[PDB]
Amino acid sequence: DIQMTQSPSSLSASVGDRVTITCRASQSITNYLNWYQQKPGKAPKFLIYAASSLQGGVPSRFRGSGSGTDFTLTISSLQPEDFATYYCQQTYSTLWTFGQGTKVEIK
Amino acid sequence: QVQLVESGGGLVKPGGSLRLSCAASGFTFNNAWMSWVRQAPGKGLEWVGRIKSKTDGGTTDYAAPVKGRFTFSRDDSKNTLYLQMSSLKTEDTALYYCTTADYDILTGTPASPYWGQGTLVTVSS
Amino acid sequence: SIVRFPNITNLCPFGEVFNATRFASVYAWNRKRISNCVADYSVLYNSASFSTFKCYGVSPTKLNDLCFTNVYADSFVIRGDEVRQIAPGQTGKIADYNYKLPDDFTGCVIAWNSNNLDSKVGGNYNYLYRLFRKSNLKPFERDISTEIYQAGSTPCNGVEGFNCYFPLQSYGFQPTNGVGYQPYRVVVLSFELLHAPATVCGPKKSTN
Ligand SMILES: *[C@@H]1O[C@H](CO)[C@@H](O)[C@H](O)[C@H]1NC(C)=O
Known part of the structure; x- marks a missing residue:
């Protein structure tokens, strides 16, 4: 089976900072994983695959990276309306896994 | 373009048979897989299960948290996905989503874009 | 003679x-x-x-x-x-x-x-070449084009990535x-x- 850790359950700060969210797993998965965005009152959408390349229509501000079992999704000079819940997800090519994200609260 | 919808929910006592139909409108059905996921209120989404494609017999990749409670079937004739459940439980009162899942070619990393609108499941005696 | x-x-x-x-x-x-x-x-x-x-x-x-x-x-x-x-x-x-x-x-x-x-x-990233297409080519037919390719599923309405790969790739001659x-x-x-x-x-x- 597969397990993973999603300690960063809430990380928000002054608008325009270098926000980041971690995604750590005990087992080895390599680059089989993705990151999604969900705004309130709407189904989650597809943003990042392979932790390297974003998806069409996504501003290049988002930047995912990492290796092995540790990965990070950050943003530089975050734009308005970016506030949303960002979810991490992993695949072993046979088994599936999700992870609780961060509910950025306006402050 | 690409569209997806769900239907078949209801408010029933535990035990009654229930069918959920997810209909894919106008991208493709016979050359791609299909997946079902859970999103409980005030909680992070969680795996529910996916099945294979091209009428190979089905992989029946049921998820761990709901092992031996649900079943899946891809109706290729009408190009839809049917999910059958019999024994409902209070802890299963979570939003349900049907999504398109298929691994890429260059990087070969599975992901699930083009999600559906979702179907609400509620049980209350 | x-x-x-x-x-x-x-x-x-x-x-x-x-x-x-x-x-x-x-x-x-x-x-x-x-x-x-x-x-x-x-x-x-x-x-x-x-x-x-x-x-x-x-x-x-x-x-x-x-x-x-x-x-x-x-x-x-x-x-x-x-x-x-x-x-x-x-x-x-x-x-x-x-x-x-x-x-x-x-x-x-x-x-x-x-x-x-x-x-x-x-090295020069100037020489491009095709890496994807709908099907093979008949003899002596050019394929000058830029329309996006789709491999797995779903169309590509002027988009790129995740089954919308750009049809042309560079060589990278070092x-x-x-x-x-x-x-x-x-x-x-x-x-x-x-x-x-x-x-x-x-x-x-x-x-x-
Ligand atoms: C190219 O230039 C060289 C210069 O000596 C000449 O020998 C050669 O014949 C030329 N190429 C052709 C195809 O004639």
């Missing part, structure tokens, strides 16, 4: 497609229709700067004595190891997506090395690799005969 032939002249420019500067890219291979001339192929044969000359039509010794309707000279650049993909029959990536030869191709395929001229200090990864300049000479009169063939030698 018994026959005489007129003074030679009008040597059409094979150099214009051999000694030229740029040979475009494989996905946009040019096409020079050489006609109405007397091409002395001997020089193209007796030269030390040509690496591979594996012909597939007629023996490359009497070619200066067979007169065809016109000769089509194509030119492009390829990876070193793929120089054997241009040959008839053999399949691969450029064979069925960028350039293909018919079953009974009756010309010749010159190729040579250019690592000293088509790679800057850090001047520090083995021969297989160095730029080879390749020319294809396809003769063509037609019910119309012939006008192109090698010079008729002269004597006292």
